[PDB]
Amino acid sequence: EDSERRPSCDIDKPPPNIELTGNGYNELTGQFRNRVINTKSFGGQCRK
């Protein structure tokens, strides 16, 4: 319900490629690998 909903934070924007920080890594080809850590579990927090 819109009566039950509340603001979690003032903004929705992350640092511009925070996504790449949660990728996996293949040491032996040297390349990055697909999404391992959820980079954006805001966790109901307004850490700005």
Partner: protein, 49 residues
């Protein structure tokens, strides 16, 4: 909420990640080869009486 530059996007349920991964390469080569040759050969012979 997902962002690229300042534009905001919706991710299809089927897709794990769409992310800029923003990488660029340029590779350039220029080559020249040149070769030149010039040959000149002559004869002269004379007699008188």
């Amino acid at each position: 909420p997902h962002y690229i530059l300042n534009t905001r996007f919706r991710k299809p349920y089927n897709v794990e990640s769409y992310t800029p991964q923003t990488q660029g390469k340029y590779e350039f080569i220029l080559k020249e080869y040149e070769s030149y040759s010039d040959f000149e050969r002559n004869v002269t012979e004379k007699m008188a009486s």
